[PDB]
Amino acid sequence: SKVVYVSHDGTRRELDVADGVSLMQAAVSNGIYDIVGDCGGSASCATCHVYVNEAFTDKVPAANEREIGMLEGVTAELKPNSRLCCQIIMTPELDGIVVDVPDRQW
Ligand code: FES
Numbered sequence: 001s002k003v004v005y006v007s008h009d010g011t012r013r014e015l016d017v018a019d020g021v022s023l024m025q026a027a028v029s030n031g032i033y034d035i036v037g038d039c040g041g042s043a044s045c046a047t048c049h050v051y052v053n054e055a056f057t058d059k060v061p062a063a064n065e066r067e068i069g070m071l072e073g074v075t076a077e078l079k080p081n082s083r084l085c086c087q088i089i090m091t092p093e094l095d096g097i098v099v100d101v102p103d104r105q106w
Contacts, residue, residue, distance in 0.1 A: 001095040005032050008103035017090040024048040024086035036105040037092060043067045045076035048085045049074045050099035057081050060088050076102030
């Protein structure tokens with residue numbers, strides 16, 4: 001299923017991501033270096049911060065309490081569409097989801 005990662009400079013990278021893989025796992029394993037994923041995906045670090053495109057923000061499962069506690073500490077601007085992408089699990093229904101990657105994670 002297609003996921004489009006748009007870097008801060010505007011370059012769009014479309015990856016095909018298998019069911020059940022987090023957007024963070026697909027990013028880090030494919031050289032999307034602007035997503036760090038330091039804690040390994042347990043919503044313990046805030047370094048997989050992305051901005052979910054408005055056409056998909058309400059299409060993905062809501063942020064649980066742990067993700068909310070960690071989003072508080074993102075280093076780039078926190079926005080209404082900020083999410084930790086290790087919390088976004090790919091499904092066929094999300095095909096085409098676009099996320100914009102901030103210019104910093106640390
Ligand atoms: S990889 Fe650590 S919060 Fe997402």
